[PDB]
Structure 1
Amino acid sequence: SECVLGQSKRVDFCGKGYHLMSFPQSAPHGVVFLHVTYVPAQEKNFTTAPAICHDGKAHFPREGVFVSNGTHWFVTQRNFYEPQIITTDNTFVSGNCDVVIGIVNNTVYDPLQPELDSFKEELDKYFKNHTSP
């Protein structure tokens, strides 16, 4: 039921590791399962920060953990390295710097600001364009 008819969150029950699916095959007076498990293979060391301050406000990874390759900070899923640019739609604000232990400094890119920056230049240029008439 928990391995064939569905996926089980019970670690080390449907095979060794993160379980995916199990294929049953009959046998004389018995059954034999083929547990398909997800086992990470290649790992690497990284520098981590419990949280991120932006403007005194603290930031926390919504899904994943803060990671850095030595120069730039990123967030990736805990079971697979896929670094992501630290963005506002990837984190949530809570508390401030003074409380979190081990928090580090780095700016978090709000995706709306650069998008509106192009509108700002268009807005500014039209005011200059409006001087001629």
Structure 2
Amino acid sequence: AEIRASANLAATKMSECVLGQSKRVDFCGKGYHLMSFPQSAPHGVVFLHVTYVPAQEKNFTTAPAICHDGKAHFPREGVFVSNGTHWFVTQRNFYEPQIITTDNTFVSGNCDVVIGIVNNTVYD
């Protein structure tokens, strides 16, 4: 019964780690799962899990939203970060600063509700 549970788990990992990419945390290795490779072993299986591990982190200042022309902007697919004097929008898991334009953010209401909104120019 114990080995059957182990083999059911191995079949699930074969389906979701080898035949797909898994969003389940720690199911297919430590880190963000990229892919996995099976290798037969005498009475079992070995899974070589290839994961993406972030490294070399840097601190930045961040704000929930950006106030421009009296309009509050929230990042579309990023977070607002600051080099120190200017402001960019970056993707979360890799520092790729972009000029805050009205294409990578969206408007929602005025800069009178967000607790922490920051003034800056949203290039159109």
Q: 2:47 maps to what in 1?
A: 33
Structure 2 residue 122 is the aligned partner of structure 1 residue 108: yes
After TM superposition, which residue ranges in structure 1, 4 or more long, deviate above 2 angstroms?
none
Report SS of the residue matched to 2:103: helix
| Distance in 2 separating the partners of 1:102 and 1:12 | 34
Q: Render the CA deviation track for 1:68-94: whole Å, top value 9, x for unaligned.
A: 011110011110000000001111000
Q: Render the CA deviation track for 1:26-48: whole Å, top value 9, x for unaligned.
A: 00000000000000110011000
| Distance in 1 separating the partners of 2:31 and 2:42 | 28
Q: 2:25 maps to what in 1?
A: 11
Q: 1:129 maps to what in 2?
A: none
Compute the displacement of 1:95 (Å): 1.1
| Distance in 1 separating the partners of 2:118 and 2:100 | 13
Report SS of the residue matched to 2:20: coil
Count of residues in Structure 1 that have an aligned counterpart in Structure 2: 109
TM-score (norm 1): 0.81
Say what the alpha-carbon RMSD is for the aligned residues: 0.5
| Distance in 2 separating the partners of 1:34 and 1:57 | 49
Instruction: Mark the runs of 5 or more structure 1 residues left unpaired by the alignment.
Output: 110-133
| Distance in 2 separating the partners of 1:96 and 1:2 | 44
| Distance in 1 separating the partners of 2:78 and 2:104 | 9
| Distance in 2 separating the partners of 1:73 and 1:102 | 14
Q: Alignment identity in percent?
A: 100
